[PDB]
Amino acid sequence: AETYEGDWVDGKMQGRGTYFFADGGIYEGDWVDGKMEGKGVYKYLNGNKYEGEWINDMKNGYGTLAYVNGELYEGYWKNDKVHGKGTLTYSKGDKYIGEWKYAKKCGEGELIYASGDKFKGQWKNDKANGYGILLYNNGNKYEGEWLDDHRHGMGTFTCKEDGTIYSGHFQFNRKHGKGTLTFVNGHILQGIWNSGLLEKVI
Amino acid sequence: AETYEGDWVDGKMQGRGTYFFADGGIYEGDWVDGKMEGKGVYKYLNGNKYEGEWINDMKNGYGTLAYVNGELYEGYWKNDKVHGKGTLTYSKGDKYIGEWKYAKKCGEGELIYASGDKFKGQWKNDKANGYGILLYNNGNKYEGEWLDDHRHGMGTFTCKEDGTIYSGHFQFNRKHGKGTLTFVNGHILQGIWNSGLLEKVI
Ligand SMILES: [Zn+2]
């Protein structure tokens, strides 16, 4: 109970030791000047488990977090929070491999869904925002702009089942605005969509 | 241990009682002439649990089977095996609602996948065989003939993303043979496919 069993260089916790915390946490790893630095394992009382780098009593560098619910993070940390390039395996099978800033997907990364769908592009605030490509499980592909996990802006949808390529505007994950359908017989249709429904042909 | 605690009409297990079996099973329900008939609950030693009808020491009629792995069957039984109209909830979320013959899907039924896809049609030997409709999660729809869970024969595929309707031959779940693509601009393409790939246009 808030004890320490390790080396005591110059009367300060330095080297390698074990520390049990008042809230129930336990740390076993390297120490400098009473700080948690180097490498070590922290066992949370809630069942979470961390193994990786430490700087100034905080996760800094590469480390892994084994969560209770089954998730696992493998990546870099800054000031005790997910930060930088890291991989996160979700409970059901989904996996994100990309950049993080302050414990949220921000930057370029890819999500491998357990359904077979694969996204890779730019993330802003834990959601798809900006340019990205979604490779659907059926072979369909969307490449274009995203806003808050919705196909939003202009993108190109190519259908694997019949080869038809849509090129035009999207709003809230649906075809909306000016666009063109190009079929495999060379013919190109121009039209106006409203919430994914073609309503006007030119 | 192979005891009996129930009514004993005319020196035979009749009425309602409890029977513990030598392999570990336990039955609690109605009895006629030493037989398990009427209704009752059988607790298997492996953790399986049955509640429903019984005729002549066997599941006959409607009853439910709570499996260990998480599955659950709700339907009719004949001679201790799944038989007739019944519903089966799979571990991950999938559910079959249809006909069974000898513990296997045989007849007309529908499977509600946890992915959102819904099939409904004829089943032969636990697989799709014959006419059936597959309503995909993306809005796509296939209606045609199936062989061993594969689109096989002639069917009609309609694509929700661009409206293109394919009508032609399928072999081993892929477009193969004579077929026609009908686009939303009225134009109809005739061609020959090879394993889902259009290779010849007429
Ligand atoms: Zn299509």
Numbering used by the authors:
A (entry chain A), B (entry chain A): 148 to 349
Quote the study's own text.
The crystal structures confirmed that each 23-amino acid MORN repeat is composed of a β-hairpin followed by a 6-residue loop that connects to the next MORN repeat. The structural studies presented here make a case that one conserved function of MORN repeats is in homotypic interactions and possibly also in higher-order assembly.
Diffracting crystals of selenomethionine-labelled PfMORN1(7–15) were obtained and its crystal structure was determined to 2.14 Å resolution using the single-wavelength anomalous dispersion (SAD) method. Interestingly, PfMORN1(7–15) displays a V-shaped dimer with an inter-subunit angle of about 45°, and incorporates a structural Zn2+ ion at the dimer interface. Although Asp residues 303 (TbMORN1), 308 (TgMORN1), and 309 (PfMORN1) are conserved in all the three proteins, the coordination of a Zn2+ ion clearly demands the presence of both cysteine and aspartate residues. Such pairs are present in PfMORN1 and TgMORN1, but not in TbMORN1, where the cysteine residue at the corresponding position is replaced by Leu301.
